[PDB]
Amino acid sequence: QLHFRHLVGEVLPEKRVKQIAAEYDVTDGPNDQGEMYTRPGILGDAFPSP
Amino acid sequence: SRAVYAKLWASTAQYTQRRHYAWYQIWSRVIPWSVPWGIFAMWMVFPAMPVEYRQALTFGIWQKPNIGTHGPDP
Ligand SMILES: CCCCCCCCCCCCCCCCCC(=O)OC[C@H](COP(=O)([O-])OCC(O)COP(=O)([O-])OC[C@@H](COC(=O)CCCCCCCCCCCCCCCCC)OC(=O)CCCCCCCCCCCCCCCCC)OC(=O)CCCCCCCCCCCCCCCCC
Numbered sequence: 001q002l003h004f005r006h007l008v009g010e011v012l013p014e015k016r017v018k019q020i021a022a023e024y025d026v027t028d029g030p031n032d033q034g035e036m037y038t039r040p041g042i043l044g045d046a047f048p049s050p
Numbered sequence: 051s052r053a054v055y056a057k058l059w060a061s062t063a064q065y066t067q068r069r070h071y072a073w074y075q076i077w078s079r080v081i082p083w084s085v086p087w088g089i090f091a092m093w094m095v096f097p098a099m100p101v102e103y104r105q106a107l108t109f110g111i112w113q114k115p116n117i118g119t120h121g122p123d124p
Pocket residue numbers: 085089092093094096097107108111112
């Protein structure tokens with residue numbers, strides 16, 4: 001239920017939260033060809049599940 | 051006498067004007083109620099306006115709340 005944007009201005013500053021999110025690989029899609037891919041995380045993403 | 055009867059008949063010739071004078075009297079007693087209802091209206095829509103406008107209607111008195119969060123980034 002937690003998202004990276006929840007930490008901004010309440011626990012950590014914005015520029016530091018971006019660095020933490022980008023250290024993870026998040027799945028997104030589908031692309032124009034109907035396939036899945038990975039990308040670094042952003043403030044809108046949820047805490048990654050193991 | 052016919053002269054007397056004529057003056058009594060004419061006593062109520064200006065009905066329409068007297069009703070207009072009634073309008074003035076009543077509306078003068080009612081119109082002040084616009085101030086209480088006006089204060090409450092502005093009081094309700096104040097927080098939906100931009101920050102820049104909120105500081106103008108109060109002559110710089112109003113300011114953002116200081117609750118200890120969302121401070122500048124180093
Ligand atoms: C002897 C006995 C003595 C006893 C002891 C003493 C007694 C007294 C002690 C009192 C102590 C205080 C007590 C606590 C009170 C305050 C706390 C409180 O209550 O807070 C509420 C409390 C929390 O408050 P809050 O929301 O946190 O407060 C945030 C602030 O409001 C924050 O608000 P904001 O930031 O969003 O906005 C603020 C803003 C707001 O600003 C505005 O909105 C407008 C600002 C622009 C105004 C522009 C005016 C332009 C014209 C100026 C004219 C100048 C003329 C000059 C003439 C000069 C002549 C020489 O104001 C300002 O910025 C400051 C104003 C500065 C400008 C100066 C001008 C002010 C206006 C003047 C108007 C004119 C006055 C005169 C009129 C007459 C003459 C003409 O809420 C609750 O507790 C809620 C509980 C739940 C309630 C449930 C209710 C029922 C629910 C069920 C409903 C259904 C059933 C129906 C039930 C019906 C039941 C009736």
